[model samples]
Target: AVCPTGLFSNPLCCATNVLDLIGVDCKTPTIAVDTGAIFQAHCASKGSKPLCCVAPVADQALLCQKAIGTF
Candidate 1:
């Protein structure tokens, strides 16, 4: 997913609900980042959901490689 400028995506895991604090089971993994009290419209139409969140700038490219490991 394409995040806005100064934003990145991180795995949300199968721990808590995005809309609420209630936990739920994820058939597959989910992705997001801690956005605090702000929101970004870019994430809405960037891609599909289980939605990715927009977070502060980081090494998202490297993070993806490390998280996914090598093929």
Candidate 2:
């Protein structure tokens, strides 16, 4: 049940589902961020930066964090 890299009805749900599908059934943990990560990735990948593209403010932060963390 892995959603797109940054598309989730709930960020936590995305994480939990991914972990669960991988046999890690339990409360999902929150990953950390260093800020502006998503923007950087967007710029690097698409030659332009994207604005906020998540539900909650926290989710937007998570998106950026995930983008950079994965990169």
Candidate 3:
């Protein structure tokens, strides 16, 4: 799923069955997530940034374009 910030901008906006979450310093060498995932809001209660999930589909090129366009 895409993060909630994205939702603020789009109704269509959307992953882990870890559907779980974590607090990344955004400095971690690597982070893992699921396509069906949701961010753990309790994480931000402590101050770290929260990055949640978004949905994707069968069109590879479309996925790429939408993702890049977000940035």
Q: Candidate 3 — which residues are off by over 4 angstroms? A: 3-24, 27-40, 52-71
Q: By lDDT, who's the top model here?
A: 2
Tens digits of per-residue lDDT for model 1, 1-71: 33233322533222224343222332123234334211222222333123232322222221221112111
Candidate 3 vs. true structure, TM-score: 0.19
Candidate 3: tens digits of C-alpha lDDT, residues 1-71? 33334422111222111222221222111233223222223323334333322322211111111212132
What TM-score against the true fold does each predicted structure earn?
0.18, 0.19, 0.19
**lDDT against true structure, model 3:** 0.25
When summed lDDT is taken over every stretch of 10 residues in candidate 3, the lowest stretch is: 58-67
Per residue, candidate 2 scores C-alpha lDDT tens digits across 1-71 of 12234443222222222221221122222332224453344343533332222343332124322322333
> Residue 67 error for model 1, in Å?
20
Where model 2 places Cα greater than 4 Å from the true spot, the runs are 1-34, 53-71
Please give the CA lDDT of all the candidate structures: 0.27, 0.30, 0.25
C-alpha RMSD (angstroms) for model 3:
12.9
Q: Give the candidate order by descending lDDT.
A: 2, 1, 3
